[PDB]
Amino acid sequence: GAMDTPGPPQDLKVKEVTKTSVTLTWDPPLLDGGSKIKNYIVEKRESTRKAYSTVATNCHKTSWKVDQLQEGCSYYFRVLAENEYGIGLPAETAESVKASERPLPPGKITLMDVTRNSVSLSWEKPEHDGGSRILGYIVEMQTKGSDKWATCATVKVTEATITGLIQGEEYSFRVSAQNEKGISDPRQLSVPVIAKD
C-alpha cells in the first residue's frame, strides 16, 4: 500500500501537571506508512516562543514526563512518530497547559474571637500558591460526636466568622486554600473551641 512516514499519534493528552512538569500520554498512529515505527519524538513549546524545543528523540513508549518546566508558564506539546523514511505527522495538544498546581495550605489558623454562638478565625496566606493565584479559602467545621467535616464558609479574605453555633457545644475548624488547579490540604486549628460567652 502507501509508502510514507507515519500518521500522527492518536489521543495525545496531558495526564498529570505540576509546577515543574507535565506527563503526556498517547496511542500509536493509525497509519505507519508501510514501515515500522522506530520511536517517537517529543517536543515542548512555551506559549510565547515561536520554536519548539526537543525533549526526547528516542522515546520507545507511548508516554513521557516533560520536566524542568518554568512555574506559571504555559506550554504546548508535540509528539511525532518516526519510521525509516523519517519523521511523521505531528500530534499537538489542543490547548496550552500551565505549569502550576494546587496551593500549599494557609498559614497557622488563629482563633480571633469566641462567643456563645460564634467563632472568628484568621490566617495568613499560603507560603506558596503552587504557581496559580489564590482564589479563596474553604473553612470546614466538625461538631463534637460527628464523623464528618462540613463546609461552613467560603471566603476570598483571610478571615471568617462562623455563626449559628450552639452554646456549650464544642467545634473544630480547618481551612484550605484554592486556586484554578485545586485545593490545598486543610490546616486544622490547633485546639477545639467551646462556644461560650
Curated annotation (Swiss-Prot):
It is found in: Cytoplasm; Nucleus. Autophosphorylated. Transmembrane segments: none annotated. Residues 8-103, 105-197 form the Fibronectin type-III domain. It comes from the Eukaryota. Signal peptide: none annotated. Isoforms 3, 7 and 8 are expressed in cardiac muscle. Isoform 4 is expressed in vertebrate skeletal muscle. Isoform 6 is expressed in skeletal muscle (at protein level). It is linked to Myopathy, myofibrillar, 9, with early respiratory failure: An autosomal dominant myopathy characterized by adulthood onset of weakness in proximal, distal, axial and respiratory muscles. Pelvic girdle weakness, foot drop and neck weakness are the main symptoms at onset, but ultimately the weakness usually involves the proximal compartment of both upper and lower limbs. Additional features include variable degrees of Achilles tendon contractures, spinal rigidity and muscle hypertrophy. Respiratory involvement often leads to requirement for non-invasive ventilation support. Interacts with MYOM1, MYOM2, tropomyosin and myosin. Interacts with actin, primarily via the PEVK domains and with MYPN. Interacts with FHL2, NEB, CRYAB, LMNA/lamin-A and LMNB/lamin-B. Interacts with TCAP/telethonin and/or ANK1 isoform Mu17/ank1.5, via the first two N-terminal immunoglobulin domains. Interacts with TRIM63 and TRIM55, through several domains including immunoglobulin domains 141 and 142. Interacts with ANKRD1, ANKRD2 and ANKRD23, via the region between immunoglobulin domains 77 and 78 and interacts with CAPN3, via immunoglobulin domain 79. ZIS1 and ZIS5 regions contain multiple SPXR consensus sites for ERK- and CDK-like protein kinases as well as multiple SP motifs. ZIS1 could adopt a closed conformation which would block the TCAP-binding site. The PEVK region may serve as an entropic spring of a chain of structural folds and may also be an interaction site to other myofilament proteins to form interfilament connectivity in the sarcomere. In some isoforms, after the PEVK repeat region there is a long PEVK duplicated region. On account of this region, it has been very difficult to sequence the whole protein. The length of this region (ranging from 183 to 2174 residues), may be a key elastic element of titin. Belongs to the protein kinase superfamily. CAMK Ser/Thr protein kinase family. Key component in the assembly and functioning of vertebrate striated muscles. By providing connections at the level of individual microfilaments, it contributes to the fine balance of forces between the two halves of the sarcomere. The size and extensibility of the cross-links are the main determinants of sarcomere extensibility properties of muscle. In non-muscle cells, seems to play a role in chromosome condensation and chromosome segregation during mitosis. Might link the lamina network to chromatin or nuclear actin, or both during interphase. This is Titin. It comes from Homo sapiens. The lineage of its organism: Eukaryota, Metazoa, Chordata, Craniata, Vertebrata. The chain holds residues 22877 to 23070 of 34350 of the full protein.
